Structures are given as structure tokens and as C-alpha cells.
Amino acid sequence: KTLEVWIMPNSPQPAEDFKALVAPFEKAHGVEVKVTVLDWGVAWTKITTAATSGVGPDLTQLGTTWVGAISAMGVLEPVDDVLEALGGEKAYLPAVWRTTRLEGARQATAVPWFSALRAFYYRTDALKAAGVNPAEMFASWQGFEAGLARLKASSFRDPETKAPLAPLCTPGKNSWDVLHNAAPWIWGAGGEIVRQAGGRWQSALNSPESLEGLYFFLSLAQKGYVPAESLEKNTAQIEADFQAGKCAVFASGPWMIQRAQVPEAKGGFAERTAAKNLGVAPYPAGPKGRYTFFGGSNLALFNFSKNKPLAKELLKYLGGPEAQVRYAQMTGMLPALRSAWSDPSFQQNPLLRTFIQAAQFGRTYPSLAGWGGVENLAVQHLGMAWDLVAQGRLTREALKDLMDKASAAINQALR
Ligand SMILES: O=S([O-])[O-]
Ligand SMILES: [Cl-]
Incomplete structure (x- = not known):
């Protein structure tokens, strides 16, 4: 049986x-x-x-x-x-x-x-050396960005790499989770990907609040806080970079806590400096909510x-x-x-x-029954916004025109 x-x-x-x-x-x-x-x-x-x-x-x-x-x-x-x-x-x-x-x-x-x-993993040793209090860095967006400015200015070198840590590591468009990486910022600014209005679902990616949260997140990369190399890579690669001591801060799941305990020999990172200097904080409170x-x-x-x-x-x-x-x-x-x-x-x-x-x-x-296509169309247009970031060319106006295009394609797929 x-x-x-x-x-x-x-x-x-x-x-x-x-x-x-x-x-x-x-x-x-x-x-x-x-x-x-x-x-x-x-x-x-x-x-x-x-x-x-x-x-x-x-x-x-x-x-x-x-x-x-x-x-x-x-x-x-x-x-x-x-x-x-x-x-x-x-x-x-x-x-x-x-x-x-x-x-x-x-x-x-x-x-x-x-x-x-x-949630955000962070190097306790790197924040200490940059004089960044983790409570303040993860209490507001202003605090999050002030934290990244002190981590950018810091002379801290990783004991193994003997090189600076990137303040923030995140994928851009070359990852399965493009929309998931942005979601907390969209939500925290008070926005959402889709909305009910006149009794049907529509794109809300071009809403005022959605654009503010998106621009806040994407512009961190444009202000020097995210390595150019991060934007070409996926979540697994960014995980590897954090383990190898190249990133002060990066978002991931609970599985990193177990990997910190497992020998490099068996696919963990127990011997790396990152494993013994591991802090965690939820995503920082946004101006219109806090979301994981x-x-x-x-x-x-x-x-x-x-x-x-x-x-x-x-x-x-x-x-x-x-x-x-x-x-x-x-x-x-x-x-x-x-x-x-x-x-x-x-x-x-x-x-x-x-x-x-x-x-x-x-x-x-x-x-939604059509969630796949909404996420896929969103991710197409977020990718083009990441391309502008990579060139230092993302403006609020350019982000709005891409999310207006995203919203027309999404509305047609839902209608
Ligand atoms: O370190 S104690 O909070 O488990
Ligand atoms: Cl949503």
C-alpha cells in the first residue's frame, strides 16, 4: 500500500x-x-x-x-x-x-x-568598526542609508580578504527573486504590486507609494552602496560573496544560520570570519509600514x-x-x-x-490565478530599471515611465 x-x-x-x-x-x-x-x-x-x-x-x-x-x-x-x-x-x-x-x-x-x-544578515565586526549602531541602522530607512554611508566611509578590512566590505550586497535583475527583493520596499513605502479597484485586480506598481519604495531601494545601488558585480549575480552567488567576506549587509532566509555551523568541506562556511560575526535584523521600518x-x-x-x-x-x-x-x-x-x-x-x-x-x-x-504573468511582466520592467541604475541613469521620472509600461502590460494580462 x-x-x-x-x-x-x-x-x-x-x-x-x-x-x-x-x-x-x-x-x-x-x-x-x-x-x-x-x-x-x-x-x-x-x-x-x-x-x-x-x-x-x-x-x-x-x-x-x-x-x-x-x-x-x-x-x-x-x-x-x-x-x-x-x-x-x-x-x-x-x-x-x-x-x-x-x-x-x-x-x-x-x-x-x-x-x-x-531578513538582513550583517557583519557585527564591520558595523562595530564603522561606528554603526545596528538598532538605529535597522529602525528606519534614513537610519539604514546613514548606516550604509558609515560602512562606505569605513577603513575596515575583512581579516581574510584584507579588502573592504561592500556596504550592501543584493542581486538586481539576474536572479529568480527580482520582485521578492523589491517587495518589502514597495510595501514599506505604503504601496503594493496589485490593487483591487472597480472589483478587479490592476497593477499598483506605478502608484505614488510603490514608486517611492522602488526608487529608495534601487537608488542605494546608484549611490555606491552595492557593488556593480552584485547587479550581474543571483541570490546564491550573493550568499557565497557574503560568506567569503565581501559584504557587510545582505537579505536572506534562516538557512544561512545552519550553514554558518557547517564546515566549508561539507558546503557550509564555519571557518569564514562571517560565520563568527553574524547578526540578524528584520527589514527596517518604512515610513508607511514594516513588512517581511x-x-x-x-x-x-x-x-x-x-x-x-x-x-x-x-x-x-x-x-x-x-x-x-x-x-x-x-x-x-x-x-x-x-x-x-x-x-x-x-x-x-x-x-x-x-x-x-x-x-x-x-x-x-x-x-491570483494569473500571478505568474503579473510577476513576470513586473520583473521585465524592474530589470530595465536595474539597467538604468547600473549606468547611474535611474531618475524618479524614468522609473515612473517603466512602471507605467509595466502597468499597461499587467492590466492587459489581468483584463
Ligand atoms: O543568546 S540567548 O539569547 O539565546
Ligand atoms: Cl502586493
Whole structure:
């Protein structure tokens, strides 16, 4: 008696980690869980083919931003029942709960599995040497920029590189997460990517507030705070640069905390100066709010499964306390289930405690069926803004004309 699950590579040994996660469930139910690991390069197309053909697994992982699109194809089983048995809506952050359904939909089609959230890592030694107080650097945007000006002026050299640290490392346009990097700034200025008006969704990227947050973020790169080399690279490469002592400050997820403990030999950075001088702070309070970008993944049940009762039991298991703590450990993510945040594995680690403070500002995109195309069209136009930054040519006026073009393309795709 077997269940099939599709996952993406969430942990260092994806298949082995997941088989170890579900071993107590297999024992309690006398069943085998078969897991297939889908590379992020192919997971979407594969899940899409499963949806159209009626051929696929019992359960699939979905990126949180995938929920709307797959739910709208009519192929996912309602899991309102699973979510109630896990404690219902108030068992989750509002931003995580929004990812359980197509936006506006009556029934839940996905169970929260784990959360990817971004906070700022910083070199405690570099801020010390630049005379930057971390509380002030991360309390306002003015403080954030004043902090980067002291880090730019600083004579601090990394003990290993014997070279200056870049004040801020961030990707520009050559990364999968272009929109995610900008989102906190758009939100913090009081804006948003999409808005409801006359009862339908429209681009809000050209709103006054959205443009202010975007220009604030992008102009940091234009003022000398971000290396030109950062703008050509992806998030993984920027991670590597921070580990190798080239960056004072950069946004990433909780997984860096585990990597700081792992030898270079085994793909961690324990021996690097950065590992022993690691601070974390949430994104700084904006003038019109304070927001932490949430992503990560949920689990869903194809309505063609012949094993819905056992699959729902496995959804309750994976979504529930013990597996929530266990898989967060394996993946270096935060549990989707808020009760799992009190586990000693989190509470005994001050860096994880800071990620839990960052979690209270949690915000996600609305779960639109057409979210992919909105994000893709946004990212096309943000990329052109990053090109202007790279030349020192981004003005507020030039940013507005690109986001007006973005907004016309987005509105047509939504209309
Ligand atoms: O360092 S103590 O806060 O875990
Ligand atoms: Cl939004």
C-alpha cells in the first residue's frame, strides 16, 4: 500500500530527508510513501502536465505563489478539513493563510508546509568598526542609508580578504527573486504590486507609494552602496560573496544560520570570519509600514488521487507539530505552523528568534490565478530599471515611465 509525493529540493539530501521525515507516519499507518524530487527547473511543467492529464502523484509541493494557478485549473482537493484539524486560520500568520486558497475562493486547496522569509544578515565586526549602531541602522530607512554611508566611509578590512566590505550586497535583475527583493520596499513605502479597484485586480506598481519604495531601494545601488558585480549575480552567488567576506549587509532566509555551523568541506562556511560575526535584523521600518517578504511551499492533493483519506492524514502529519519542527530543521526554513515556533531548536538560537520577530511583519502577494504573468511582466520592467541604475541613469521620472509600461502590460494580462 503506497502514497506518491512530489517535492522540490528543499534540503541538502531532498529524498533521504523526506523519507526520514515520513518514517513515523509509514510506521503508524503500515504504508510506504514514495517520494520523487522535482528540480525547480522542471517542477512547474511537471505539475501542470499532471493537472491536464489526470496522471500524477497523491500529494505535490507547490510554491506559495503557484496555489492560485493550480487551484483555478479545478484539479486540487479541498483541504478545509485538514486546516481545521491543525487549528484553523488562527494557527497561521495571515500572510501564510492567504496562500491556502485561490484569492477570493470559498474552499482551501493547499496546506502550509514551511515559510521562506528574508531578513538582513550583517557583519557585527564591520558595523562595530564603522561606528554603526545596528538598532538605529535597522529602525528606519534614513537610519539604514546613514548606516550604509558609515560602512562606505569605513577603513575596515575583512581579516581574510584584507579588502573592504561592500556596504550592501543584493542581486538586481539576474536572479529568480527580482520582485521578492523589491517587495518589502514597495510595501514599506505604503504601496503594493496589485490593487483591487472597480472589483478587479490592476497593477499598483506605478502608484505614488510603490514608486517611492522602488526608487529608495534601487537608488542605494546608484549611490555606491552595492557593488556593480552584485547587479550581474543571483541570490546564491550573493550568499557565497557574503560568506567569503565581501559584504557587510545582505537579505536572506534562516538557512544561512545552519550553514554558518557547517564546515566549508561539507558546503557550509564555519571557518569564514562571517560565520563568527553574524547578526540578524528584520527589514527596517518604512515610513508607511514594516513588512517581511514571505514565500516557501505548501502541500496539495490532486482530486484524481485514489487515496484521499490517507493523503489527508499525511497532510495533517506534515502540517502538524513534530514534522513542522523536524522539516524546518532539515530545510533551514521557519515552520508554517506558529505553535512550532516555541520549540527549543528555535528559542535557544538568538538568530532564529530574530527571524521569528521578522515573521510578525509577514506579507505575501495575493494568490491570483494569473500571478505568474503579473510577476513576470513586473520583473521585465524592474530589470530595465536595474539597467538604468547600473549606468547611474535611474531618475524618479524614468522609473515612473517603466512602471507605467509595466502597468499597461499587467492590466492587459489581468483584463
Ligand atoms: O543568546 S540567548 O539569547 O539565546
Ligand atoms: Cl502586493
